[PDB]
Amino acid sequence: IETVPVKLKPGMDGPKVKQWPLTEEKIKALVEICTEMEKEGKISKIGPENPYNTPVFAIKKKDSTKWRKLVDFRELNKRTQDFWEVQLGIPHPAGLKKKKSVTVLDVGDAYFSVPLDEDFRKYTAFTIPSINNETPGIRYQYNVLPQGWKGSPAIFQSSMTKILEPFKKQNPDIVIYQYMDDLYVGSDLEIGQHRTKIEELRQHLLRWGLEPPFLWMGYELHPDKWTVQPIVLPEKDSWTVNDIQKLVGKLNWASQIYPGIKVRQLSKLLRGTKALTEVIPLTEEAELELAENREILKEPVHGVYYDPSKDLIAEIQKQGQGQWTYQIYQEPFKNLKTGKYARMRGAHTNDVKQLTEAVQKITTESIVIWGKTPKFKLPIQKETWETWWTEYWQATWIPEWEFVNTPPLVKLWYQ
Amino acid sequence: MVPISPIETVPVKLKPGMDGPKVKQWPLTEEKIKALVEICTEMEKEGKISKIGPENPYNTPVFAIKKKDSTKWRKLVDFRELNKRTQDFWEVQLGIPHPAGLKKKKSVTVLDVGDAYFSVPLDEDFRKYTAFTIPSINNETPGIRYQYNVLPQGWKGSPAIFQSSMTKILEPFAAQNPDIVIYQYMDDLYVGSDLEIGQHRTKIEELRQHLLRWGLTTPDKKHQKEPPFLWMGYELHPDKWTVQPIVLPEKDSWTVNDIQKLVGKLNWASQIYPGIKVRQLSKLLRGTKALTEVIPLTEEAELELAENREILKEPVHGVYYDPSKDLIAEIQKQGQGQWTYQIYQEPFKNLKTGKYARMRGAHTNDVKQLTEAVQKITTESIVIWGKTPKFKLPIQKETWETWWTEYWQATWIPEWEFVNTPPLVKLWYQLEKEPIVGAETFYVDGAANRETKLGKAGYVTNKGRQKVVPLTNTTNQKTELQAIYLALQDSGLEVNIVTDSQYALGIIQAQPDKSESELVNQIIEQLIKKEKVYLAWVPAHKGIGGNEQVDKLVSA
Ligand SMILES: Cc1cc(/C=C/C#N)cc(C)c1Nc1ccnc(Nc2ccc(C#N)cc2)n1
Ligand SMILES: OC1NC=Nc2cccc(F)c21
Ligand SMILES: [Mg+2]
């Protein structure tokens, strides 16, 4: 009810980010949403003495028909002071990734009950554009904690802990982790039990609230079943020259990750200048070397540790037929997680929609495991991604990304 | 008197840490001083400026400029220094409407709102920074000191604050009259509708009456400006639009500057004249910016210019947007990285046209360029109309499917249909997914000495076919490409090629059909002639038969 003082980082002005082009349906949705927010006091119109701007668009969350306003506060979040005053940080719960069900709640509507520091509000300015710039863009700023801003969970944290005390005391084995506008609630109960505890939890926030438009939803995950991708080599009875070449190439790559990998004896099978399709019998020396390599590859990579002070990097490869591989790492060749998708939803003839869904799933995994989002290296031309990703986005956060323009040879090794 | 509502002031600040201007007033002639004193007395009578005491420490210089061919002087207060120190503002005019996104209107009336400008008060706490001094006659008394009470012409914040103040005044009128449009440009309001003229003129009078609520008077003797409007380089008419006349000069010899001006005109023209091209003429501007340097026009530039003159021989107009109809965008390949497009709703009635040029880069292909053009038109269309057009593209559906399913990147083009108008975009080659049974296998390699730039490229095959070629003035990368070229030259229609060059694989896996490297282009021409090609990569220096032998032959 009283505002927490907020500042930008030293020697740092507010965001001045261009609003990107919006479709007619998104503009009309935003006009309707913002007219109601304004009536409710959450936002107010601003004048030309506020030169700041942050982009806005609109999404439909997974399984809903109602538009949600999404502000892209990535720039404001970079420029906002860090929040360690009451707590150096919320030590990330390593047990969340171990639960049999984790449900993700959109709780961001709660933030609107806390006023934003009057001196910081100008920095949350945003614009609803008009088609063809025929009328002046509608300019607003927030009067309350905005969804998507990194300060909002920080400032609301005291209020959230208090709302949740009764549920936590009564259900002590539940893991509850907050990330931006999401609440992650992990249990090891039967899903019907689980859903009921989730609904129990909603009521505490409905109760406190006295309506939240997306609180009723639930994104159900199951991280104990999350799969990884170790390095595996083919098991064959007939090896062609080409097969052995590909094997030697894969093993050479793997030897950058794993010390003791050897290819001497396998390379020796190819002596001469043979046709690619010719079948080569493995010698005993080569079968032994291969077996030794297989055994090395069953072990974990050496010297792999997470440093919370370093960025997480996520790489994605398109494998075809709807399949995507990915790796999350901080240092080259020291993967912290690898994985693979294929279940790409309602996107069989759309690569970009599939990639956008993969980016969201990887980010979700990253949040659950380390409590932060990775920086993506995306296999797509910048202009294609920027034109389309907002059409498929369903999450209330947005990670950072860069673009890969040269085809990586290593895609082959993750197939 | 009738009370009027005040116009809310915008609070204004100087940039952090800066103070107001303290700029010396230049000496003026006795003649200019008398003129400024009379001018400012009138401005003061009208409430625009007020005299101030000597405490105010700020100053901005004032000038007197003779309005040409008149005995009347005009005052100029030079706010350059205050502007450097004034905060930045939100500028709403950054995006200007494109005519092709406008809607047809039966009537458009203009209203002069120049007098309103001076009903807009300046933030009381900022006025002190606008102080200026008329020097005294003979410098024998203190100069007369004034500050502004209204938005000064030439001050940084005046356009943004005037527009935002007028928009706020206009908002309830527009909201409650959804059957008109209102647009502010300079000191004029443009009001458009589809109403019968009597109702339309009624709305205009009602608007004049709304404006009076703030004491804002508009001239009775209605505006002289009438359709067609000359606005931002366009001509707007009630039911069509075009660019203002495009006249390409005749010239016996061309300067850098002339060619820059020519290309700018062509670019402007290309939004409604279909087919405009500027590649060859822009090529002439490469690198140099000596504005007076003469450049001979290539024969290719002369043909491009001649083709453009023909396109521009007679007027072309665009139609306005009908939201009840779909938007269609059709694209053609023009050659040399150039693409042209038309956006229409009814056949043969374009809303607008435009062009797209290949991005600078080492290697490229037509499918990528077409995709980029689609992505550009899509974004332009979202800006102008708020929706993606349906596309008509010169690429077969099966070609696109083969491309995107096998391309290493994610890629997508929105709803489209094939239009069979040459030249068609096609896939010139496609590499095999598996080694070819029965096709000879070429193990290729090259190497170069970094100091002497001498090198070798060659191959050895499973049939004992071998070649090594000595090369001069070369590099490891070039020799690695030369080796693949040799294998393609000397093989039959089906071939397996084994390379250890990550560089060459990176290029070939990008699937170029044209390159800045003539060696890559030679490789592409060979690939086009094959029936099947499988390219296999192996790590260098690993004892891999075939690879090891050729590496030995070429590194010697
Ligand atoms: C952007 C704009 C510039 C001018 C005028 C600028 C200046 N000078 C005048 C108006 C009224 C507008 N605003 C809009 C908005 C929607 N449709 C239209 N269509 C429209 C406008 C003018 C003519 C005509 N003749 C025909 C149709 N204009
Ligand atoms: O940029 C322009 N704006 C308006 N009219 C023009 C006429 C010729 C060239 C040109 F660049 C322009
Ligand atoms: Mg070599």
Curated annotation (Swiss-Prot), chain B:
Residues 436-556 form the RNase H type-1 domain. Changing residue 301 to L: 68% loss of polymerase activity. 10% loss of RNase H activity. Changing residue 229 to A: No effect on RNA-dependent DNA polymerase activity. Complete loss of RNA 5'-end cleavage. No effect on RNA 3'-end cleavage. Residues 229-237 are annotated as: RT 'primer grip'. A motif (Tryptophan repeat motif) lies at residues 400-416. Changing residue 444 to G: Almost complete loss of virion production. Changing residue 188 to E: Drastically reduced incorporation of phosphorothioate nucleotide. Loss of pyrophosphorolysis (reverse of the polymerase reaction). No effect on RNase H activity. Changing residue 403 to L: Almost complete loss of RT p66/p51 heterodimerization. Complete loss of polymerase activity. Changing residue 266 to S: 17% loss of polymerase activity. 30% loss of RNase H activity. Changing residue 158 to G: Complete loss of polymerase activity. No loss of RNase H activity. Residues 46-236 form the Reverse transcriptase domain. The record marks 403, 416 as: Essential for RT p66/p51 heterodimerization. Mg(2+) 2 binds at residues 445, 480, 500, 551. Changing residue 169 to L: 80% loss of DNA-directed DNA polymerase activity. 23% loss of RNA-directed DNA polymerase activity. Mg(2+) 1 binds at residues 112, 187-188. Changing residue 444 to K: Almost complete loss of virion production. Changing residue 189 to I: 29% loss of DNA-directed DNA polymerase activity. 46% loss of RNA-directed DNA polymerase activity. RT is structured in five subdomains: finger, palm, thumb, connection and RNase H. Within the palm subdomain, the 'primer grip' region is thought to be involved in the positioning of the primer terminus for accommodating the incoming nucleotide. The RNase H domain stabilizes the association of RT with primer-template. The tryptophan repeat motif is involved in RT p66/p51 dimerization. This is Reverse transcriptase/ribonuclease H. It comes from Human immunodeficiency virus type 1 group M subtype B (isolate BH10) (HIV-1). The lineage of its organism: Viruses, Riboviria, Pararnavirae, Artverviricota, Revtraviricetes. The chain holds residues 600 to 1153 of 1447 of the full protein.
